[PDB]
Structures are given as C-alpha cells and as structure tokens.
From a paper:
At present, the best structurally characterized pLGIC is the G. violaceus ligand-gated ion channel (GLIC), of prokaryotic origin. Each subunit consists of an extracellular domain (ECD), predominantly in a β-sandwich fold, and a transmembrane domain (TMD) composed of four helices, labeled M1–M4. However, the GLIC is a pH-gated channel, activated by lowering the pH, with a maximal activation at pH 4 and a pH50 around 5. We instead found that proton activation is a complex multiple loci mechanism, with the key contribution stemming from the coupling interface between the extracellular and transmembrane domain, with E35 acting as a key proton-sensing residue.
In the lower part of the ECD, the principal (+) face also carries two acidic residues, E82 and D115. E82Q and D115N display significantly higher proton sensitivity than E82A and D115A, respectively. Assuming that Gln and Asn faithfully mimic protonated side chains of Glu and Asp, this would suggest that residues E82 and D115 are also proton sensors. To investigate this idea, the structures of E82Q and E82A were solved at pH 4. The E82A structure is similar to that of the Wt pH 4 structure, whereas that of E82Q shows a marked local reorganization of the Q82 moiety. A structural analysis was performed on E26Q, E26A, E35Q, E35A, E67A, E75A, E82Q, E82A, D86A, D88N, D88A, H127N, E181A, and H277Q mutants, by solving their structure at pH 4. All structures were in the apparently open conformation.
Residue numbers in the entry:
A (entry chain A), B (entry chain B), C (entry chain C), D (entry chain E), E (entry chain D): 5 to 315
Write the structure that this text describes.
Amino acid sequence: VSPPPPIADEPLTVNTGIYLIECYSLDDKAETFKVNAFLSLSWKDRRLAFDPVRSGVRVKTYEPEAIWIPEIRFVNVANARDADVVDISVSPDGTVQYLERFSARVLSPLDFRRYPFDSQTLHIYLIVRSVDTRNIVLAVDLEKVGKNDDVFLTGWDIESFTAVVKPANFALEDRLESKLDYQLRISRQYFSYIPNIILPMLFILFISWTAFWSTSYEANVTLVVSTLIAHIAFNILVETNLPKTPYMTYTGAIIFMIYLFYFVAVIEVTVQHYLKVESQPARAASITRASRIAFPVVFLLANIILAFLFF
Amino acid sequence: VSPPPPIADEPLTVNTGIYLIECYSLDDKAETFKVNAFLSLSWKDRRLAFDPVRSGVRVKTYEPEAIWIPEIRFVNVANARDADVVDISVSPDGTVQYLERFSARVLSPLDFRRYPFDSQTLHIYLIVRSVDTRNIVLAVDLEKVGKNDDVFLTGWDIESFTAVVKPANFALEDRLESKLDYQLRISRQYFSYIPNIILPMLFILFISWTAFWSTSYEANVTLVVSTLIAHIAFNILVETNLPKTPYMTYTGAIIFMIYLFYFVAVIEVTVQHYLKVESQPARAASITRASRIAFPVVFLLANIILAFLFF
Amino acid sequence: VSPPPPIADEPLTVNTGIYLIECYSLDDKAETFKVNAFLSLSWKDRRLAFDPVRSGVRVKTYEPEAIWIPEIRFVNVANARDADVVDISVSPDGTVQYLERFSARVLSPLDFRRYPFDSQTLHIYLIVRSVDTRNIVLAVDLEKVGKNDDVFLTGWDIESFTAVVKPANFALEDRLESKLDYQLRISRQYFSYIPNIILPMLFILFISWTAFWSTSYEANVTLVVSTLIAHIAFNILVETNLPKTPYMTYTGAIIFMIYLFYFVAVIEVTVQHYLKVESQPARAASITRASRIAFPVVFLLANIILAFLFF
Amino acid sequence: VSPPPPIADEPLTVNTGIYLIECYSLDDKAETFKVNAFLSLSWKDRRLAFDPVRSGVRVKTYEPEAIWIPEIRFVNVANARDADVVDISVSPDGTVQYLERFSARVLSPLDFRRYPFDSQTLHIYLIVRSVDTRNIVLAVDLEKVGKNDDVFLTGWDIESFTAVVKPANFALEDRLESKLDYQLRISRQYFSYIPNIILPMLFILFISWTAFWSTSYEANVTLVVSTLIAHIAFNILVETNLPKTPYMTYTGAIIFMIYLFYFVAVIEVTVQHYLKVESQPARAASITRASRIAFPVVFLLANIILAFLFF
Amino acid sequence: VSPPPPIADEPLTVNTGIYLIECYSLDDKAETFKVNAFLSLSWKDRRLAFDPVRSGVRVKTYEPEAIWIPEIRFVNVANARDADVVDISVSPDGTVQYLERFSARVLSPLDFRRYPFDSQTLHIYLIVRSVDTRNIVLAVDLEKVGKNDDVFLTGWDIESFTAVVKPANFALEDRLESKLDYQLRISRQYFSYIPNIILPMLFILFISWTAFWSTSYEANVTLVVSTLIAHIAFNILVETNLPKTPYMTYTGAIIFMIYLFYFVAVIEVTVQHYLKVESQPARAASITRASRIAFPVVFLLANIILAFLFF
Ligand SMILES: [Cl-]
Ligand SMILES: [Cl-]
Ligand SMILES: [Cl-]
Ligand SMILES: [Cl-]
Ligand SMILES: [Cl-]
Ligand SMILES: [Cl-]
Ligand SMILES: [Cl-]
Ligand code: NA
Ligand code: NA
Ligand code: NA
Ligand code: NA
Ligand code: NA
Ligand code: NA
C-alpha cells in the first residue's frame, strides 16, 4: 500500500492527539519516565472515500494491514513503544480516524538547579518521516489532547499536558521530518525533604555550635567531629537520589557550604584549646563569645545569598 | 469480524469476572503490584447460534481468530497484560463463554498516613471502548469473581477481593467507555516493625536520657550525640522502604518528633555544664532533676496526641 | 481439534512428570525461585491409534498443531512458563508421549522461624482444567519425576524432589480442576552465618561486658554505646536479607534480646557512676561484681530458653 | 532470494551509515551504553533495475521479504538489536536504499586511569558475513553518519560521532567478514566530584592535621581515628561507582595515598604521647612542630607527583 | 521432516563448534555469566545430496524450515538461548553446514576458596536428544572452536576456551542424550583488592596495636573499638560481593581471624587498666611490652598457616 496521492503539490497532514492514562516511574537519576496513553491519528485518504447511500454504512472499519497507515514514531524513547490498535474508522469523504493505546519509557532531561523546589517540563516528541511519493506534516487536534483525572506521579504535582501546535519541520538524511512537541509540566512535592533531610541536617549543625558554650576541648572535638560524620551521611544520602550534574544544585550548594561551617568550627575549637594551654584563656574567651553570634549570623546571611542566587 | 448486531437500540453487555491465582511483588515505593489471574468474559452473539439436533454438539469451541471478541483492557497497568486464552465455548443461543489466564503489573496508589499500621484498597480497572456499529457495556458475574486460598502477599493480610457491580460509563474521545472497579482489600502485618524499628529506636532514646543521672559533660555529650546518630540511621532505614509523600506518615511523625527530644537533651546537657562551670550546680541540679520527669512525661503525652491525630 | 472421546463416563488421565535440570535464584525476600526442567505428559487418544503392520512405523511423531494436547498450567507461577516442545510420540494403541523443556519463576512461600537453621518445602503445582466434552484428571508417572545430579541451589542443600501422587480434584468456576503437588525439599547451609554474623555479634557484646571490670564511666559509656551501634549495623544487615514476617525468627529473637542486654549494661554503667559520685563506691562495687556473673549467666540461660522454644 | 550476481570477480559493497537519535544509560561498572539510532544501508542489485519511462515510477518501494537484504549485525552487542524497517527504495539502476531504526545495548570497555577527569571512545562495530555465492564488503557513506543535536549522556560531554571509513576485512570460520568501526567520543563532566568527593575528603584530612596543634592524646586519637573512618566511607562510596580495574585509577591513587597520611599521623600522635609520659615533652614538641610543615608539604608534593604520572 | 535415515545401525554424528564473540556480566553471587557466540553445526543428510554437474551449483543454500535440523540445546542455561540463523549450506555429498549467532545467560558454579586469588572453569554444555527413528551423537570440530581477540571479562583474565572432544552419552527418560563440555578457563585480577580492601584492613588493625604504647585506657578503648567498627564495615563490604558458601574463603578466613585479634587486644587493654587501678602497673607493663611483639608475631605466623592451608 502506497500513501494517499496528492491533489496539488500540498503535503499530507496527519492530525495527532495524546491522551495520558497512566503516568509513572519518573527516575530522577536516569531522567526517564514511563507513560501509558492513547495516540489518535487522522488523515484524508480519497482512495478510501465511499457513498453512504450506495454502501449502506455511515463509517467503514478497517484492519491495519488493509489500508495505508503513517509510520509515526517517538523521538525520545529508549525502545519502540508497545502499541495495540484500538480502532480504525473511515468516513465517507475518506477521513481516516486511527486510535491506539501505547506504553513507552520516555527519555526527557531534568534541571536539578532548584532541587527539591524544582519544576520540570517533560517532553514527548511525535515524529513522521516523509516518503518519496509524498511529504507528511504533523498537526495537533486539541480536542484529542488531554489526561485522565486519576493520573498521578509519586512525589510530583501534575500541572498541565499541552502540545506545541506548530511542528518542527526539518530535513534528516535528505527527507522531511515533521516533529511535534507534547509537554507535561510537573512540580516537585518538596514537603518530605523538610522533616527528612533539611531539618535533621540543621539540628546536627546547631548541635555542633554548642561547643561555643564549652571549654572542654575533648567534648568539643566529639561534638563537631560526630555531627560532621552525620552531615557526610546526609550528603551521601542526597547524592544517591540525584544524578551527576555539571552545575550546582540548591541542596548541593547548602550541603557543601555546611562543610565550610564545620571546618571553621574545628579551627575555632583548636584555637580556643591552643590559647588555653598557652595560659591565654581571656583571648580564647573573646573568640568563643564572638563565634556564638558570628556562626548563626554568617549562616543566615550566606543562606539568604544562596536562596537569592537560586530563586 | 464486526461486533454482534443489536436487536433494539440496546448496548452489548459483556459479563466479566476476575479470579486471583497469584498475588505478588507489592512495591510500596512504586505503588505497583503484580497479579496472575483468570479473566472470564461472556456475551451474546446471535450470529454464532446453532441446532443441538442438526449439529450434534451441545457447545462449539472456537479459536480467538474465528469469532468476534471484545477488546477488553486494564486502565491502571504499566504495559499490556500477558494473556493466554484458556477456553472459548459457544452455546447454540450464541452465548459465548471466554476464559483467559493473564499476568500484569497493576499501578494502584497507596495511603501511607498510618504506616506501618495502614490498610489499602488495591484497584484493578477493567475497560471496554464502544465501537461505531454498537455501544459496549460491562457487567459483573459475581459467580466468576474470587481468589485462590493459597493467595499470599508477603508482609500483608489479604482481606477481600470484590467488584463494584455498576460500571462507570463515560465518554472519552467521542466514544462510550465502560469501566469496572475490582477491589483487593489488604492490611499491613506491622509485627516485624515493633522488634526491628520501633523498640530499638525507643531503646537508644531511653539510653540518651541516662545523661539526666550524670554530671560528666564529656560522657553526656557521647551519650546524646551517639544515640542521635543511631536515630539518623533508623530514619534513613525507614525512608528507603517508603516513597516521598506530600503528607506526614505516622512513623515519620514519631521519628521527626524524636529529633526535637535529642535537640532539647543537648540543650539540657549544655545548660547543666555551663551552670556547673559558672559555680551554680544547685540551679543545674534543679534543671536535671526536672528533666528526669519532664522528658518521659512530654514524650508519653506527645505520642498520645500523635496516636490520637493519626488513628 | 477436540479432546479424546470417552469410552464410558471415565475421565481422561494425563500422566505427568517433572525432571529438574537447573535450579537457581532462590530470592528469600520475594519467596521466589527459578526452575529449568523437563515436563513430560502422556495420555491415550484412540483417534490417533494405528496398525504397526499396515503403517510400517512403530511410532508416529506429530507436531503440536497436528494433534490435541492438554492445556497444562502451573498454579504458583509469576507468568506463563517459557516452554519449547522437545518430542511428541504416538504408540500404535494411541498412547501419546509428550515432552517439553520449560523455565519458570515459581512463587513458593518460606518459613523463616528457624532462620538460618531452617528447612523448606518448595512447591510446583501442576494443573489442568476440564473441558465441556470431557473431564481431565492428572496422574504422576514416578519414573519421569527426578532431578539432575549437578542441580545446585547457592546457599542450600537439595534434599529431595518428589510428587504427591494423588491429585487435588476440585471445582473452580463450575469446572473440574486437577491439581498435582511437586515438592522440592531444601535445607539452608547455615555455615557462613557463624563467622559472618553470629560470632562477630557475640564478640562486640562480650566487648561491652568489659565495662564490668572498669570504674571509668567515660570509657564504659564509649564501650557499651559503640558496641550497641555495631549491633544495630548487624540487625540492619540481617533484616535486609529477610522479608517482613508476622512472627519472630530465631535470629530476630536473639538480635532483639541482645538490645535488652545493652540497655541493662547502660543502666549498670549509670548506677555505678551515680553511686561513685554519691561517695558510695562500696555499693557500686557489689553491683559491678554481681554483673560480671549475672550478665553471662542470664545470657546463656535466655539463649537455652530461645533454642528450646524454636527447635 | 539469493545475493546480487557479480559482474566481474568484484565483491558487493554495502554502503552504511549510523545517525544517533538517543544515547543513554552509560553503566561505568558494566562498560555498557544504550543506543537508539537510524541504520542506513545501500547496495546495487542489477536484478531490481527498471526503466523509469516504461514503469512510470521514479523509485520502487519494496517490503523486506520481497527482495534480498544483507545480514548486517553488530559485534559488541549484548543481544541482537531491536530494529524496525522505516523504508526500502530502489532507484532505476538497481541502487537499493534501506533505512531502519534500531535500539541496542552496546558493550564497549572504558579506561578509568584518569577518573573522574577521563575521556572515552565508545565503539559500535558493524559487521557483514560473506556468502558462498559472493563476498560482501562494507563501506561508509559519510553523509548518512551523524547525531541529533538533543543527544545527551548524563554526566558526559558528547564530543564527536565519526566512522573509520576503511573496514577491517578478515576471515572467520573460512568466510570473509567486513567490520566497520563507529566511534563516539565522550569526556566526563568532573564538576560534581569536586564538591561531593574531593573537597569533603580534603576537609576531613585537614581536620585530622589539627592534632599537630594539640597535646591532648585522647582528643588527637578521636580526631585522626574519626576522620579516617569518614575517609573509609568515601573510599567505599567511590569503589561502588567504579568496576574492579587491574590498574590504579587517579582517584584510587589519591584515596590510597591518604591512608598512609592517616597512618603516619597516628604514629606521630602515639610518639608524641609516649615521649610526654616518658617526661621528654621537648623532643615531642620538636616532632609535632615539624609535622605541622611536613604533613602539608609532603601531601602537596606527592599529589604533584601523582598528577604528573597520571596526566 | 524426519531425521536422515541410517545406512547401517550407526548413530548420526552432529559436529559442533562454539566461537565466542562477546563475554560479559559474570555475576559472582549468582554464579551466572552472559555469552554472545557463534554456534556451528555439521551433519550428513544423504537425502539432500546432489550432482554438481546436473544442478550447476557447487553448494545449495536452504532456509531452516526447508530441511531437517537437529534440536540442539544448552544444559546450564537460565532460559532458551536467543538465536538467529546466519547460514545453512549443503555440499553435493549431503554434508550440511549450519551457523547461528546466539546469546544466553549461562549458569556455572564458582569455587571461592582462594578468593580473590581464585581461578575458575566456566562450562557451556551442548546437548542433543535422540529420536525414535535414530540416535544422535555430538562431536567437536576443533577448527570451529575459538574466541575473538577483543573478548574481555571485567575483573578477569581469560586463559583458554577449549572443548572436551568425547561426549557424555547417557540415558534420560528412556532416550539417549549426547552432552558436550565447552570450558572457558578464567583467573581473577586480584590487583584492586590490595589497595581497596587488604591494605586498608591491615592499616586499621595496625592502628589498634598503637594501644600497646599507651597507658591511657580511654584512648585505648577509642583506638581498638573504632578500628573494630571499620573492620566490621570491611567484612560487610566483602560479603556483599560474595555468595553464601558452605566453606571458608581465603579472605573470609583472614577477616574472621582479625576479629580474634581485636578481641584479645580489648582483653589486653582491660587487663592493663584493671592492674593499674589495683596499683600493680609493673605487671601491666610486662603484659603491654610482651603484646608489642606477640600481636605482630602471632598475626604473621597465623597468616603463613592460612596461606599454606589455602594455597
Ligand atoms: Cl516509538
Ligand atoms: Cl532543515
Ligand atoms: Cl522530502
Ligand atoms: Cl491491559
Ligand atoms: Cl504456566
Ligand atoms: Cl546486532
Ligand atoms: Cl539453548
Ligand atoms: Na497499513
Ligand atoms: Na477476534
Ligand atoms: Na494441539
Ligand atoms: Na529479504
Ligand atoms: Na527444520
Ligand atoms: Na571517645
């Protein structure tokens, strides 16, 4: 079967639509997400046109093998989508209405700069390659683009599912390619990060600062060193849930900065002890009293600077 | 093959049933579970009807390709179910009795608010899309809905497997869809959480409280800081087995609250030492003696408040 | 093709056999194991019977499509088995001899009460569903039930592979079902648990008991608290290799009991220090001297009680 | 269908091309990467040649079954590629233009010597096995070799995708094999390693060196031993992300060398304490004062030597 | 299609060969490895014999369906191999030359006694089951047994790939089975274990021995207990990479023995402190001075004994 013959030198418009049924397994590290959706296709094939009076039927149902169907692919998929044809209906004017249900693992990169207070735009790229007989162009049928109400993505708020109506027409290996962009806007549910990572990390840091109210070097060493080890555990815990980025993330920035706070606290604890041994506790006391105000103030200001730079 | 022609303007009723054989791999983080079950289908096709006397046979067995079979799908599946037709029997009134054995990874969300003392309702949504010739409606044959006695779900008690008899008939992409809800009620076996997480977590917390019977700041610092690190390990252990929720879980609430108890214990340990150095041990003694009663009382009352709010 | 017509009202006996070739991947947490075996089937089809003199051949070889073959399934499988027909041989009397090689992931629950000194009975349930024309009953051909000598299951001793010769005949969805039970008896190789978990766990516990020969509260706090953290690591290590059980395991019981021993050791260490500060070291000495005998004696007796209750 | 008959004793040239669409899942430990690309093939089949005037058509489109297609395979793949034919076009002179879209898990070894400042050359080996009728040779059509702009590999910078135009023609099992080498040059994004591994590792090492400003053996023991445990955690973290190499990696060298620095710091801390107890603190002071300069100087010089040897 | 008819009562010899192309994913815990290789088969079918003069052709190429092909299987595979026929060539005398490219996950047990200085013999068992008409025997064509030069197994040195030329002919379910043994000899690249596990483990042990040059019980307790916890981390790290063995491994023996060294070091540290408190430091000094020589000497001798027993 050959594609529909053109009337004039016009290309064949294949109207598309994606209706999300299931959205799952957004792998942050792999920047992949799995989708289960309806893919609707519509085009005019004048060769399939019929008279409703003569034939008796209002619409004709065909099997995929029986008629010409456009070779529609996804750009950003790991493997070819798992699809099952639901219906093929032909109107008297030759307007074919195709519907299939598919599942695919979509590969869409994520921007972790504002993690875990980040928002993303997941993409689903529909593509058609033009044939030698005729050029094929994709279009969006806005009435057949949507999502089920029950569609949920664990740890994410699904904002919108829309399509960029004008396709990206380009040439690949001396043939026209018509690419459509389907955008699923999501925003992370940062809630859990607050009692699980952020507050426990702040608590251990604040515990290290109690060494500014102690003259016992042995106890101070235990305070700052133990809490630093807990901070290392939280840093390792955070980087397991995230991929290796060529940029600094919001959480990554905070975590890294906190290391400097532990390092300077060790220096303060060392200086205080050296001075006490040197029989200069008055100078040591001035440094410790200053540190009680300096450490929280510098921490608060540095965080304001970070939050400003990131948001 | 086209669907059965209607007598009047009535829709085609496809009687359904699901008999669970195997139930496994309930992934709490992924909110997925695997199922192996029998799917029974029954509908009337007057075109397949035949003579007992003339034909000789009581029932006719057909191969799936030979006759019209409704395109029955699952809504909440990752991929198309793995199915193998077991039997197709036609009565001579044209009543078709279809049976297939399938396996699928069902995507059903879970409510972790009361974890690990939570109960869930897993869903299996059966769906049929109406054709242009005729509208297809699903029905429940209660005699063909059940589960095997041997059906076990590791770490869960299987309560019931029932079906919501009235389908959710709606329009999707200008076509009628008949959706049925199959509900598998389960309840978590919380037993293991008590000797593995809850009691060990209480033991380390109670060990930190021994600092209220010690004047040794160095020993108290070691007691409260070490036990806090063990509590961090238990917090990390718990959040690995659970997904990131936009709400607080029962275990999550307790674990988070315990951090505040460690933080105030550090403050007490610090205050006590500062006062002793300041040659005010009488005031420090009053604070330590009060803490011996305050810490367990406030812990007990706060837990009563949490248990009340959650259950 | 229809099933063999009955002479009298007798059911069709399908003689079965399973010969294990490969046995692997016993997942303790998932209570699954993978199998690669031969499945032999034999039944009489009088319609396929022939004269050896007239036909010339002693046996006729058929392709699966050519003749009626019983729909044999496994009850406790995740998905339908991966099978490849090896041979189909028909004797002159119509006795069909079918052989296929299959692989499947069998779902069989395990009893962890005596872990790691536990033994299990893995099950493989063969099943046939009766047809409308005739009832099908399964039988065991003991000469075609066995296992290869090289069959090994990492960390397990394969004891026996036998079949319960009398089938469990029952009705499921108004049709007879003939179920056969194939039992693979295994026993865990507990050896590795001794130098890897049990002895290291005892060593750290015995190290904590050295605090009964020390008056240094600071050193005792470090001894009991550090060893308790190592015990937590061993508890976490053990529960990762095991699934969540609604009962107590042997190892689980020991591990949990050891927490109580650490808790009482902390109390002893606290009491001793409080008394010393109170200028009552004579009373503290009596308590410490008693603890030197009490702790190992109570530990030995409690373990005898546990071993008695569990074995 | 037999291959195209030769004019003279010349071999059949199959012009090839690979256009990368998706590049993902580079597993460092497994030395595997997944690819989704276009595979273009072109050869002359004089038997398929036609007159454009007589036939009417400029090009003829065939189904794969209809014509002879060369058996093209990948050398370094885990399993046979997942492919779907896109187009087969025959020119009047018999020049066949084949295009397929495929996905495969490519097995290409990596050189970790300079990790995480390493660059790699991933290989994709195309191969054709000669037939008895004729010898088949592969060629590169440089116009059909490329990559999509959006092609991204998490944690890597994609440098180039080129093909070694001259094939490696050799004999395997007494038949000619024509092998082509497609090279994907990548370079690691080392950025994240600096705030996540390198700096935290340096911070804990520098913290251990504060013991050179302390006379408190108990505090020094806590400083050097605790920081060493954190260094062990970083060593374990690094070797999980890497495979077992029969050579030393850059990061591996640094990490190993740092152990020696901790070991000598323990010796210094021990020597200092022994001398103080021996009532020789003047000699101990000379050793500690020297260590303050020796440790950072030897660390800086040793790192210069390592960086020189590795880069 | 039936097998080739015998001349005399001789069995049908199927000459085999395996040429390794890709060797990957050797899972130590699962005792599995993946293979991608060429499988060559050759047998004489007199029914396919032809005259080169009359037919014109020197060799005839057939499709697998057209002629009788022996049912060749692998014994030690997880699932049936993924195979794709490359060529089938028939010589005038009826000598068929079959070649296929396959991939399979081979299940071959490993001996960990000498780990990580162990060598293994991986097996690939080829098997053919005799038919009722004729008995089939396997043979090795040594000219078609080999491996590609580029064949690499991460963390292993590939020594040789040879075949045991004489098959293991036996009866299984009253039919002859001809089994061939293909052996891939490998030896572990132990290099990485030295700077990653062995030396760091020795360093922490040697650090614990510094307590023999200290009289500070509090510092000694910190030294021996902290290093013991690091040794536990290395023991856990080692047992994750290894399966549970009913025997002791070389590394397992060393690791276990080191626990005894830590235990006796705790006893020494305890005895020394008890004696000092008892105002007997002269006796304590004798014990500590002896331990300085005893501990390294006993460690060196015990390791010589272990190395002797294991190698
Ligand atoms: Cl696709
Ligand atoms: Cl363009
Ligand atoms: Cl074009
Ligand atoms: Cl489905
Ligand atoms: Cl099955
Ligand atoms: Cl391939
Ligand atoms: Cl096989
Ligand atoms: Na078509
Ligand atoms: Na059908
Ligand atoms: Na059949
Ligand atoms: Na072809
Ligand atoms: Na064949
Ligand atoms: Na300490």
